[PDB]
């Protein structure tokens, strides 16, 4: 990596001295040394990059977003200087984009990634990085165009393949997605050994009836992406007790279960009142988890945040649930009514995280036709009774009754998570 232009070679002794302070962990002294070099040599790209790298380390030491914001600007400054070597220009803007993403400055990262592609139009990896930037802002359409361009010049780029396949699968182009995800994982290219691509390749195969799916789940388990073939969540705290079905006593949340079952009819009646008088509060399921049929949800809590308008529609239910922070405070779960109609089949799937358990309270359950499989075990609901499963295990639902089926879904923190972990885990 050639990082020194003509002038920087002449001041290499000063540049090396400041960098040695950084490598020895004397970050404060290293920042001031590179700051002095920037003051004395304001056009040196290596001095500016050293300042930015030191600010980068200082932000890690202080855990300061604001210090990192200064580093992000100094990386940009490197690129504006005259006579910047190409390798240093790429490193500086790539680190700038990376740190922008870390801070959640996704639009800024996109501008930086777009500048990189304009400056280095033949660098396929930079286009791949741009595609990631679009995916992180939710722009699947522009991401798809980026990976199409990559695959036109380098058809066997495994990173582009798995990301192109991921987008196809997200767009419900299930059969089309399989060879891209498969060949991309099989390429072994850097960035392809990723649990997300194992997860969606196996799921796409299950949706088309390809029996090879579980061979890929087994390989993902053996490579450390999944806790097991059955439990395939990717946002995990390791060591939590892993079992598909739970009893109320096993969870320890017996007071919550008792209150749900003692008061189930008020929960039912408010749900029915919304069905009859405010049905627009039930929103269609929006994660492509249905093969067919009608499934809608009316959500009272999500990410540990109460929906005030939603609670106007079920005020007694919300009042009841407020006494149980084990569910209202579960920032990796929801509290919601779930209605499912006949002719509905929910694809086998897994939730995102092993940090929650999922309670189902039966509200209106037809006598026949409704059932839920979790792992290798199938059960059914009962009116006024709570079922508890770990939805990080693969589960699947059928509705073949002659009338609607209404349940109440109550997520709780995994009972073995300490209060310290329940406070510091990012919301999902």
């Amino acid at each position: 990596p050639k990082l020194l232009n003509k002038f920087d070679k002449t001041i290499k002794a000063e540049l090396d001295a400041a960098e040695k302070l950084r490598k020895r962990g004397k970050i404060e002294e290293a920042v001031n040394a590179f700051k002095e070099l920037v003051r004395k040599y304001p056009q040196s790209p290596r001095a500016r990059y050293g300042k930015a790298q030191c600010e980068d380390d200082l932000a890690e030491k202080r855990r300061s977003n604001e210090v990192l914001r200064g580093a992000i600007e100094t990386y940009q400054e490197v690129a504006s200087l005259p006579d910047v070597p190409a390798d240093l220009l790429k490193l500086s803007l790539k680190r700038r984009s990376d740190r922008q993403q870390f801070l959640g400055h996704m639009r800024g990262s996109l501008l930086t990634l777009q500048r990189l592609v304009q400056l280095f139009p033949n660098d396929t990896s930079l286009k791949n990085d741009l595609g990631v930037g679009y995916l992180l802002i939710g722009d699947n359409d522009n991401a798809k165009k980026v990976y199409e361009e990559v695959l036109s010049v380098t058809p066997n780029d495994g990173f582009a393949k798995v990301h192109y396949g991921f987008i196809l699968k997200a767009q419900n182009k299930i059969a089309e997605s399989i060879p891209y995800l498969k060949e991309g994982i099989e390429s072994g290219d850097p960035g392809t050994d990723d649990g997300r691509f194992y997860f969606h390749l196996g799921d796409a195969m299950q949706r088309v009836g390809n029996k090879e799916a579980y061979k890929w789940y087994e390989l993902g388990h053996k490579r450390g992406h999944f806790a097991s073939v059955w439990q395939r969540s990717l946002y995990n705290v390791n060591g939590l007790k892993a079992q598909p079905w739970w009893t109320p006593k096993e969870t320890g949340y017996t007071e919550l279960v008792k209150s749900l079952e003692r008061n189930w009819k008020l929960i039912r009646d408010e749900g029915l009142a919304v069905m009859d008088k405010a049905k627009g509060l039930f929103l269609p399921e929006d994660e492509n988890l249905r093969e067919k049929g009608d499934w809608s949800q009316f959500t009272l809590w999500q990410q540990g945040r109460r929906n005030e308008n939603a609670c106007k529609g079920a005020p007694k239910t919300c009042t009841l649930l407020e006494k149980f922070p084990e569910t209202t405070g579960c920032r990796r779960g929801q509290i919601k009514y779930s209605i499912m109609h006949p002719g509905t089949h929910v694809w086998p799937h897994t939730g995102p995280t092993n940090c929650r358990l999922r309670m189902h309270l039966g509200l209106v359950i037809p006598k026949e036709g409704c059932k839920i499989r979790c792992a290798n075990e199938t059960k059914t609901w009962e009116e006024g009774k709570v079922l508890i499963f770990d939805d990080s295990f693969e589960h699947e639902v059928w509705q073949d009754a002659s009338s609607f089926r209404l349940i109440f879904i109550v997520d709780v923190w995994h009972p073995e998570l300490t209060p310290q972990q329940r406070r510091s885990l990012p919301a999902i």
Binding site: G104, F199, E287, Q302, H349, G351, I428
Partner: peptide, 18 residues
């Protein structure tokens, strides 16, 4: 988009720095 029942998004958590 959020990962509520499934794992369909590229990332399920928000980027917010330290």
């Amino acid at each position: 988009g959020k990962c509520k029942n499934g794992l369909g998004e590229y990332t399920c958590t928000s980027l917010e720095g330290f």
